[PDB]
C-alpha cells in the first residue's frame, strides 16, 4: 500500500482514526482482501485454519464478512521489476472452506482492494478490511485494520474515515491521490525530494504533482526516472473493479458434515475443536442491529462555540 501514510494521518488528522473494539462492529458487512488475508495467516494448513477461526470470530461479534480475491494484476512497481530481468492451489483451497461455511466470495477483475473500495462506496458493505491504506487512496470511505488479527494479539480494530482525512488535509480525493503517490505508492517510484509531512504541504498549495514538479526544479530535488506519476494517479481513481450492484452477497448456513468431512479428515486436525467451531459459527447467524440517527435525519452541520 501507501508508505508512512498511517503515521502521517495519526500525526496530522487523528480525528479520522478511531480505536474501537471488535464488538462495536456488530451488524456490519465488511469487504476483506482474501489475498493479503490468506497471506497473513501463512506468515501448511494455516491458509485455512486462520481462514477458519478468524472468520468465526468475525461472525461471533456480528460482523458479516465477504472475502475478496484478486484477478489479473496491473502495472505495479516492484511487480513488473523482474520482467526487467527476463500457487492458487492453497488459494482456492480457501474459496472452498468459505462457501462450505456459508460465506460469500468475489473474483475481483484485478486488484481486490480497489474492488473492496468499489463496494464500500456503493453501500453494499460497511468498510473494507485490509492492512494496506491503499483502499483509502482508491476512494473507500471506511477502512478497518486488524480485523483479521489473532484472537491473542489483543489489538483493537483501527478505523479510518476518508471523508475526514480529505477534510483536514483540505484536498479532494484526487488531490489526496497525488499525496499518496509522493508518500510512497507501490505502483510507481516516489520522489526522493519531499518528505512525509513535506509532501502534504506542497500538495496543499499545488493541487497536483504536475504543478509541484514545474515549481521546485533544481538538481537538489530531481524527479524520478520513468515516473508514471500519471498512470498511477489514474488507477487510484478509476480502477478495474466488478460493479457493486452486479451481485448480492448472502451468508448461508454452515454445512457441518460436508465441511468437517473436508477438514479434520481430508486435512487432518483436532476434531473436537473444528466441531465446536462449526457449532459456534452456526450460532452467530446475524449481526446488523440498532440504527443511527443519520439513518433518518440529514446532518445539518456543526455549531462551534464562540
Amino acid at each position: 500500500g501507501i508508505q508512512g501514510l498511517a503515521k502521517l494521518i495519526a500525526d496530522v488528522a487523528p480525528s479520522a482514526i478511531r480505536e474501537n473494539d471488535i464488538k462495536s462492529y456488530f451488524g456490519r458487512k465488511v469487504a476483506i482482501d482474501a489475498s493479503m488475508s490468506i497471506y497473513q495467516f501463512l506468515i501448511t494448513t494455516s491458509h485455512l485454519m486462520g481462514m477458519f477461526y478468524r472468520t468465526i470470530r468475525m461472525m461471533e461479534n456480528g460482523i458479516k464478512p465477504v472475502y475478496v480475491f484478486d484477478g489479473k494484476p496491473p502495472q505495479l512497481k516492484s511487480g513488473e521489476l523482474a520482467k526487467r530481468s527476463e500457487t492458487k492451489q492453497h488459494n482456492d483451497e480457501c474459496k472452498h472452506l468459505l462457501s462450505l461455511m456459508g460465506i460469500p466470495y468475489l473474483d475481483a477483475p484485478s486488484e481486490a482492494e480497489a474492488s473492496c473500495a468499489a463496494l464500500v462506496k456503493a453501500g453494499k458493505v460497511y468498510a473494507a478490511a485490509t492492512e494496506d491504506m491503499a483502499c483509502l487512496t482508491f476512494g473507500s470511505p471506511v477502512l478497518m485494520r486488524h480485523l483479521t488479527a489473532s484472537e491473542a494479539k489483543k489489538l483493537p480494530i483501527q478505523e479510518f474515515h476518508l471523508s475526514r482525512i480529505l477534510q483536514e488535509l483540505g484536498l479532494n480525493q484526487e488531490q489526496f491521490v497525488d499525496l499518496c503517490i509522493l508518500l510512497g505508492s507501490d505502483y510507481c517510484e516516489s520522489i526522493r525530494g519531499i518528505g512525509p509531512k513535506r509532501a502534504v504541504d506542497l500538495i496543499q498549495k499545488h493541487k497536483s504533482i504536475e504543478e509541484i514538479v514545474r515549481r521546485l526544479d533544481p538538481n537538489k530535488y530531481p524527479v524520478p526516472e520513468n515516473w508514471l506519476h500519471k498512470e498511477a494517479h489514474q488507477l487510484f481513481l478509476e480502477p478495474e473493479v466488478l460493479d457493486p450492484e452486479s451481485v448480492e452477497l448472502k451468508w448461508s448456513e454452515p454445512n457441518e458434515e460436508e465441511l468437517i468431512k473436508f477438514m479434520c479428515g481430508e486435512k487432518q486436525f483436532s476434531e473436537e475443536r473444528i466441531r465446536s467451531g462449526v457449532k459456534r459459527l452456526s450460532k452467530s447467524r446475524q449481526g446488523s442491529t440498532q440504527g443511527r440517527l443519520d439513518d433518518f435525519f440529514k446532518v445539518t452541520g456543526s455549531l462551534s462555540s464562540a
Partner: protein
Amino acid sequence: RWLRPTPPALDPQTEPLIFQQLEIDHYVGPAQPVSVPVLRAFGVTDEGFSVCCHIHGFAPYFYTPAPPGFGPEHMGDLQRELNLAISRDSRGGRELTGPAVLAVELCSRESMFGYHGHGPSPFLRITVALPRLVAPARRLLEQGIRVAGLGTPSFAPYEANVDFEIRFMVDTDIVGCNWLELPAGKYALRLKEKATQCQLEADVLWSDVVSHPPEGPWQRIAPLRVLSFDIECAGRKGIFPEPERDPVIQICSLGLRWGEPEPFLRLALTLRPCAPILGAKVQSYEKEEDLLQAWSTFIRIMDPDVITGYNIQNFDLPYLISRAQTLKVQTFPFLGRVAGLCSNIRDSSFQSKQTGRRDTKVVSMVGRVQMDMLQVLLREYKLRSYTLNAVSFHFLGEHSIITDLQNGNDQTRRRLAVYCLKDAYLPLRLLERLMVLVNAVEMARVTGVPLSYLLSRGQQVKVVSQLLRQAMHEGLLMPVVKSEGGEDYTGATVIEPLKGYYDVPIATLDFSSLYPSIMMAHNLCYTTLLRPGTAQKLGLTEDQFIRTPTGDEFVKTSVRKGLLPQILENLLSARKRAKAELAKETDPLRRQVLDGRQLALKVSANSVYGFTGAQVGKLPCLEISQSVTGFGRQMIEKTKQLVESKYTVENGYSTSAKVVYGDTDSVMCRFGVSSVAEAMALGREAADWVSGHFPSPIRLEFEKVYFPYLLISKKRYAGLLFSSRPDAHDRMDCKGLEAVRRDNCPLVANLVTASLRRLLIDRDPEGAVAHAQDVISDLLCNRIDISQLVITKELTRAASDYAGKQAHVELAERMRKRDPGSAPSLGDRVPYVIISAAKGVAAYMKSEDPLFVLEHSLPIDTQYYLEQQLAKPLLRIFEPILGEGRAEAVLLRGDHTRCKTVLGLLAFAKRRNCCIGCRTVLSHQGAVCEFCQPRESELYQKEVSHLNALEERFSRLWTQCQRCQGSLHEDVICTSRDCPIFYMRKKVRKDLEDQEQLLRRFGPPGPEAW
C-alpha cells in the same frame, strides 16, 4: 613522574619479540606497502616496556551459497559477479558497493542447523575491502539487484556475518590477554616512523605472528601499571556542582605495578599553597589551567595500562573535559596513546532481564583500559546500598563545608588533601582484595573475548565466540534465523509440599550440573537435530536415534558428535578445577571469593543452555529447550517414585519414608529416624543407589540433613544445617523468607532472624514471645532508631512506573527546593520512610527522604509499621507450631503491650506542668502532687537511674566518632547517612536535655556559690 625502563639493544634480524597484549584496535590507513584496514595491538614485555604492533594485510569476508544455475560454476560469471553492471539503472546496485575487491572463491562447506548428512556442498566466499562495506552489500545483494547475466538469481542468504576483531581472533587463535611472538627477521621497527607514543613500535604482516596458548609457563601475568584518582570541586550552598561554574580544586592519584604489595607513586595536585604530607609529593598552582595541564602531562609521562576509580565514568572524566572546554585550554583532551587524537563524550545504554537497564556515558581512550569499580559491583553483586561507605563497611569495616576548608588556611587544605588521598586509595584495596582482575583475565582466557567486552556486553558474544571457535574444526557455517516472535514453552515442575514444622531429620539429595549434563549425555545439538522427514524413508530407529518427551528425534552418538557437548565439557572442567583449588583455603573471605569464581563459571555453563531458548537473540532452537525441561521433569518424578518406593517397612528397613518436598533439582526426603548419624548413613546410601539408573555424567548426591525443619510455602523454608556429625552444626538456612529480601525494613528482618534463632536453636517460645513483645513495645513507646525504619526500592524504566502510582517514584520525581541537580536517576535505589498523616487512601502521599525528616523533624506512623510491615510475617512464622490460639497469643501479647503509647499552631504552647506520680495538671511548678507527696523519696529514686543510663550512652557514642575519625584534638565532621552512629548521636543530646530538666523540678542538693 617515574618513567618506564629504557629498551636497550633489540635487533630485529636476530632477536624475536615476546609480549602480552591488552587492547586491539581497527584503523583505516594510508602508507600501504608497495589492504587499507590495518590492525593495532598494544602490550607489555616480560620486563616492562610498552609495545605497539601494526598488523597488515587483512580484510573482512563472508559466505553465501552458489545458486544452482550456469552462473556460479562458470568462471566468466564468477568474474562477472566481481565485475560491475555499467547500465544507468544499476546506480542503486553498483555504486554503494561499487568497485570493491569482493572477489570470487569456491569452497565446499555445510550449514549448521539440523542434520541432513555427512556430505558438503559448494559455497561462495566473498571478500570485501572495508569492514564498513558489508552493511550496504547486505542491503544490495538480498533486497538489491542480483540480475547480473543470470548468475545469481535472488535470493541466496548471507551466512557468518560477524565482527571484524572477533573474526581476526577466531582466524589466528588469539584470545584475550595472550602471549604473542614475532619471530626473527619478520618484523621491522623503523619501518614505522613514530605516530604513537610507545617505546617499541613494530610493523608486521598478519601471517608472521605466533600465539602461545596460556598453559604451563605461559600462564603468567606481566607487570602492568594501574592508576587510581579522585577529584574535588567547590560548590555553592544547596546547588550540586555544574561544570560551567564550579572549579576543580584538587586531583589526587595513586599508582602501582601489579604484583608488588604496596604502591610506588602517590601524588596530590592542589590549587592553593598547601602543607607537606609525609609519603607523597605536593605541588601547588595559582590557576586551574596549570593544574589541568600538569595532570595531562603526568598522565602522558607515567603512561599507565589500567585506569580505575569509583564513579569516574559518570562524574569525573566528563567534568574534567567540560571544565577544560570552558577555560580555553587546547592541549588537555589528548589523553590517549595515539599522538594526534582528542577524546569525546558519548552516551550508551545497556538492558537485560538479568541486571536491568543502565545508562552510562563513555569517554574515548585508545590503548588504555578503564575499570570503574562501581559498574563491577552493580553487575556482579546484589546489595542494599551501593555507596562507597556502604560497600567499604560491607567488605572492610568503616560539599558546602569543603568550600570553606579551601577558602581558609593551608592546614585546612592539608586536611582536605589527606581526605582526598584516602578516597583515591580505597578502590585499589577493593580491586586487589576481591580478586577482580585475576578473574577477569581468567574469564577472557577461557571464553576468548577481549578484556573490554567484559564491562560493556552480556553473555551472548562469549557463546557466539566459543561456537565459532569450535565450528572451524569440522567445516560448518552458521545461518541467520530471526523471528518475531515465537511462543513460550513449559518450564520446571515443583512438587506439592506437606507444609509445617518438622522435628525429625529430612535429608536432601540433588543432581549436580543438571541441564548441561542432560545436554551432554543424550547428544543434543543444533548440528544433530533430526527434522521430522529426513528419518524417512530410512527405518533404523534402534541405536541410531532417540525420542524426547516433547516429541523430537535426535541422532545417537555413533553417527555424530555435537558442538554444545564439547563447549559445555570444557566449561565444566574449568569449574571443577576452580572447586578443587577452593577445597584448600582456610580464610573465610577468600573462601567466598573462590566461591564467586566458581559461581561465575556455573552461570556461564547455564547461559549456554539459555542461549537456545531466547527468541530475541541470534540463533534460537526452542525444540532443544523443550527437550531439556521434559527430561528434567521426567527424572525428578523418577527420583521421587524410586525413593519413596524402595525403603519401606516390608523391605526389611525401619520406616517407609515419605517425600515432603522437591523443586526441579532437589528432593527432601523424610526418613523417620531422629539420629543424625543414621539419617546421614541411609541418605548417602540412597543418593549412591539412585544414581545408578542413568547415563553419565548424571549423578545424584547427598548434600545435607536439616534438623529441625520449617516449611511455609513454595520457595519459602528454613532449617538448621549439618555437614558432618562431629561437626555438630554449621548455621541456619533461610530460603526465600523475610530476612534475605531487600524490600522491607531492617527492623523486620532482624526480628525474623532473632525469632528463628530463639525458636530453632534454644527451642524456647516464651523468650520468643517476650522478644517480639519488647520490639513492639519499644516501637510504640518511640525509642526505635530511624536506621531500622528505612525502606529502599529500585527506580526502573519510567513508563512501567508511569502505569501505576508508587511511593519511591513519587519521592524521586518530586524534586527539592535546595537541589534540582542531585536526584535519583534510572537504575538506582531510592530510600524513604513513611510519616503519619490522615490521607489513608494513599501510602504514596506519606513518603519522605530520611535526611529531610532528619532536618525537619516529622513524626512517624507507628500504626503503619505495626500492622503493615511487622504483623503479617510474624503470623506466617508463628502459626504452624501451634493453632489459631497462637494468632490470638501474639495479638494478645500485643494487647497487653498496645495499651502503652508515647505521644504552625505548635509554637503557641502553654507548657502545662504535670504531677510526676499520677499525671494531674495543676498550677505551680512543684513536681509532686498533694495526694502523692509522701512517696517522693521513691519517686526521686525512680528516674535518677534513668538519667544515670542516659549519661552512660552519651559518652560511649561521642568518643567513638573520635576513633573513627582518627584525631583526638579536632572537630568531627561526618554526616554519613549509612552510619548508624550519625543521628543516634543526635537524639541522646535531646533525651539528656529533657531528663536533666525534669530533675530540676526537685530542688538543688546543695549550694554552689560558697
